[PDB]
Design a protein around this ligand. Structure first.
Ligand code: HEM
Lengths: 55, 431
């Protein structure tokens, strides 16, 4: 809170943390795409896809 | 070259050469593999091996005569060779196997021995000759459901159903007087050939070849024959080209000479004046390539073939080649046209002036069947010398810029991409 209730310090620190966390999400999206690249996507049949690929 | 029609309707053509030590006499017919249907495909390949059978070749060898035969898509030939002074002996042999007596070659003992020999050749061709069976699959996917897609050797499934009554039916419709040209090359003069033919009176009935229903048409398509147990990848790719009797016949031949042939293991072929060789020699993208321009009676093909072991960089070899074809429309230079003029005159000077009278008899007879005469080599050289840079850019903007292609491939061709990323390289996005 920065005090005894939800007050002026609570709102001023909630806005500064709101500016920052979308940039942490953007860094975790890059780490998400790096793990996707080493194995590729799945397919709705659940079997291997290495026999028939298109770019 | 002298052409003369006789009183009974036989066309005689002769190219005399007094500095040759042999002579060749033969008959060329104007029906090939493109005059069959999918059921009797292979009857021309069977008629060739009946002519070259052992009991026929033993009769000719006692007189000092040699036999040859050639099956193509538009013509067939049956040629006898001898010494210059035995030319009436080779006319009597050709008389007794096409006119007066043909039922002794089609006996049941000779037919079944010949049929199992041809079945062994086509089976060996399909499993061992990979650059040549890819080019035959390119004809069958570019001209599909049209007479120009049948293979000249026949297929293995169609050859096993042929009997002796199929060969007699094909001969009665196509081996006619109005479909034939009698040729002669080497040390033989025109008047002794005409007087020797006129001495035997030769009734020679007045039939006419059957006409085809379907006209040949090009279709953009592809066929893939993947085989991961083979060491290389073999690919052919083409657009629709020029027929015989086209006004752009020599312009299409000069455009293929600009890109030419290549062998990666010959030191002098790596030094040629071709701008494509700068791109492909850095990472060694291929083993060999060659550019062609094939022309038939109805249509044609223009493209290239290749073979490589760099199976992980196939998409760079196709991309670099098609980006050089784009330059014929926008930015082809003057030195490239003058270099290709000199190399084209050397190429077809070695084709029409070899020392083989069997090769000259095939080229002479195939041309009189289509045009009625033969163009001289001196007049073909003046047509090549009058081609400009504007003639090349006008031809390539009509035939190559943003056009449909046909692809065929075998071997380790996993790295060859889809139709639509190869089709989109036929324009540049720049202009
Ligand atoms: C901002 C958030 C996210 C972004 C930009 C994102 C992006 C992507 C992309 C582009 C793919 C590629 C293949 C596809 O579209 O299926 C993918 C796959 C995948 N994502 Fe996400 N994703 C996000 C959130 C999530 C969440 C919340 C989960 C799970 C709790 C998740 C789990 C997965 C999985 C398991 C796959 C693989 C699916 C497959 O290959 O069948 N992702 N993601």
């Amino acid at each position: 809170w920065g005090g005894f209730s939800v007050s002026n310090p609570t709102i001023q620190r909630f806005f500064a943390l709101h500016y920052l966390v979308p940039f942490i999400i953007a860094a975790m999206v890059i780490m998400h795409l790096m793990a996707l690249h080493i194995h590729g996507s799945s397919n709705p049949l659940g079997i291997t896809g290495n026999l028939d690929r298109i770019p | 070259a002298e052409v003369t029609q006789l009183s009974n309707g036989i066309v005689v053509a002769t190219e005399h050469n007094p500095s040759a030590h042999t002579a060749s006499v033969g008959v060329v017919f104007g029906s090939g593999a493109a005059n069959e249907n999918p059921y009797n495909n292979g009857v021309s390949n069977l008629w060739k091996n009946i002519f070259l059978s052992k009991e026929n070749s033993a009769v000719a060898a006692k007189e000092g005569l040699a036999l040859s035969s050639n099956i193509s898509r538009d013509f067939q030939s049956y040629i006898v060779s001898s010494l210059p002074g035995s030319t009436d002996k080779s006319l009597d042999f050709l008389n007794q196997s096409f006119i007066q007596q043909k039922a002794n070659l089609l006996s049941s003992s000779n037919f079944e021995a010949t049929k199992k020999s041809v079945l062994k050749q086509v089976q060996d061709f399909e499993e061992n000759d990979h650059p040549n069976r890819v080019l035959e699959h390119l004809h069958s996917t570019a001209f599909q459901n049209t007479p120009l897609s049948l293979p000249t050797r026949g297929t293995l499934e169609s050859l096993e159903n042929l009997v002796v009554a199929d060969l007699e039916s094909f001969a009665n419709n196509h081996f006619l007087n109005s479909n034939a040209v009698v040729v002669g090359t080497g040390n033989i003069k025109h008047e002794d050939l005409v007087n020797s033919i006129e001495s035997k009176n030769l009734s020679l009935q007045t039939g006419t070849k059957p006409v085809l229903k379907k006209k040949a048409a090009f279709l953009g398509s592809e066929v893939r024959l993947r085989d991961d147990t083979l060491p290389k990848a073999w690919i052919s790719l083409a657009v629709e080209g020029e027929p015989v009797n086209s006004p752009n016949y020599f312009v299409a031949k000069l455009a293929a000479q600009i890109f030419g042939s290549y062998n990666a293991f010959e030191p002098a072929s790596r030094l040629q004046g071709i701008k494509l060789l700068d791109n492909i020699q850095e990472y060694q993208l291929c083993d060999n390539f060659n550019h062609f321009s094939l022309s038939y009676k109805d249509s044609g093909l223009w493209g290239f073939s290749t073979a490589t072991r760099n199976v992980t960089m196939i998409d760079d070899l196709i991309h670099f080649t098609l980006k050089q074809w784009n330059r014929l429309t926008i930015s082809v230079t003057d030195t490239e046209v003058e270099r290709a003029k000199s190399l084209l005159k050397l190429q077809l000077g070695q084709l029409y002036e070899s020392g083989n009278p069997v090769n000259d008899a095939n080229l002479l007879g195939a041309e009189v069947l289509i045009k009625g005469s033969k163009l001289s080599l001196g007049e073909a050289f003046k047509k090549i010398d009058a081609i400009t840079v504007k003639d090349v850019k006008a031809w390539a903007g009509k035939r190559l810029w943003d056009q449909d292609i046909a692809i065929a491939g075998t071997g380790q061709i996993e790295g060859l991409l889809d139709y639509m990323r190869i089709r989109s390289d036929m324009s540049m996005m720049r202009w």
